Structure 1
Amino acid sequence: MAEDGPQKQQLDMPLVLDQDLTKQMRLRVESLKQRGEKKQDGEKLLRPAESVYRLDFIQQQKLQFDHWNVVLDKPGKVTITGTSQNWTPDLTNLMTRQLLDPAAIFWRKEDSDAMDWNEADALEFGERLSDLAKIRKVMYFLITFGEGVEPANLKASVVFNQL
């Protein structure tokens, strides 16, 4: 019974990129080449356009996913690929066929202020995220920067309904 006015409160979680963390992985690969490792069983090569985003689930369940909204300073294209809470690139070698369901694609055109994305592929990953999220207070997402996006000009804000 809120007396202020707003009946249902709302809370948005700003996911933030981790470009510096991406550079740290590259340094480890450079050290490996000095002694070589013959990693031909499955070399893990990330693209300089891959940054790691981190999300902190502050509430155990009062939070609810309403509508993810990603904002870019300029139009363009970005690919978000999800990973099993177990297949981690640092603990496992990045494999293309061992990826779970395909990655969702979000893109904003110049005459469009709204981005069009695959709701069907994203919707399936929505409910799956609803569980693994209640058990893990933090989750990392991989994003790819296309052409026309400056390094840190990416901001990801998702609106959630707090009960």
Structure 2
Amino acid sequence: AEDGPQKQQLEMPLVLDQDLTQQMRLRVESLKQRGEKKQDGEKLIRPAESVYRLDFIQQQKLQFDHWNVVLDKPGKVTITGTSQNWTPDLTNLMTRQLLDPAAIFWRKEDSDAMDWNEADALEFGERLSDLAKIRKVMYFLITFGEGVEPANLKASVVFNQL
């Protein structure tokens, strides 16, 4: 097999999850207004982070091909996946539930080309095929650097269908 254009591929977008993001925002706020301490080991959402969602329209016979992360303005974004054991409806995200490594993408000033941490972005992507088997939905925390917001970002993952 030689890698080529005629391969069945599926592109699955990472969609902003407003209500989960809002739920997490509220959580940090409540903790302040009440002067309460966060849970032992909890991950509190920083204002620059937003929760994204990826719905595996197919879970079996998937092979990670590449990331399709694009910024329409110079900037930087970090995409950190979360454990497939974290069910947002049930618990507050734990720091240990953040997957290592994260995929970091950036666009420098006068160039239009994106660049990223190739080795880690690949390692992370390879994991998605197995994570899809655990459940149809997966959550991510996308950290936006200075100058960029969710509106500037278009992220998706491309899998070759086996």
Fold match (TM-score > 0.5): yes
Percent of aligned pairs with the same amino acid: 98
**Hey, what does 1:126 align to over in structure 2?**
125
Number of residue pairs aligned between Structure 1 and Structure 2: 162
In angstroms, what is the RMSD of aligned CA positions? 4.1
Separation in structure 2 between the aligned mates of residue 6 and residue 117 of structure 1, nearest angstrom: 23
Q: Given that residues 13 and 55 in structure 1 are in contact (C-alpha distance below 8 angstroms), is that contact kept between their aligned partners in structure 2?
A: yes
Q: CA deviation at 1:43?
A: 5.9
The alpha carbon displacement at 1:147 in A equals 1.3
Q: CA distance change for structure 1 residues 21 and 98 in 2, over 3 Å: closer, same or farther?
A: closer
Deviations 1:90-109 (A, max 9, x none): 76665657755242311111
1:109-143 CA deviation, whole Å, 9 max, x = no partner? 13333222222222222333221212311111111
For the structure 1 residues 98 and 71, does the alpha-carbon distance in structure 2 shift closer, same or farther, using more than 3 Å as the test?
A: closer
Once residues 60 and 27 of structure 2 are traced to their aligned partners in structure 1, the CA distance between those partners, rounded to angstroms, is: 38
Taking structure 1 as reference, are residues 94 and 3 closer, same or farther at Cα in structure 2, changes over 3 Å only? closer
Unaligned runs of 5+ in 2: none
SS for the counterpart of 2:151 is coil
TM-score scaled by length of structure 2: 0.75
TM-score where L is the length of structure 1: 0.75
Distance 1:43 1:95 in 2: 4
Per the TM alignment, residue 8 of structure 1 is displaced from its structure 2 partner at its CA by 3.6
Q: State whether residues 81 and 102 of structure 1, in contact with CA within 8 Å, keep that contact through their aligned partners in structure 2.
A: yes
Maintained 8 Å contact 1:42/1:93: no
Q: For residues 65 and 82 of structure 1, do their structure 2 counterparts lie closer, same or farther at Cα, with a shift above 3 Å needed?
A: same
Structure possessing the higher radius of gyration over alpha carbons: 1
* Residue 52 (structure 1) shift: 1.0
**SS state at 2:54 partner:** strand
Deviates more, 1:37-46 or 1:139-148: 37-46
Separation in 2, partners of 1:116, 1:60: 28
Of 116-125 and 52-61, the range deviating more from structure 2: 116-125
- Tell me if the contact between 2:62 and 2:160 (Cα under 8 Å) persists in the aligned partners: yes
Higher relative contact order (CA 8 A, sep 6+): 1
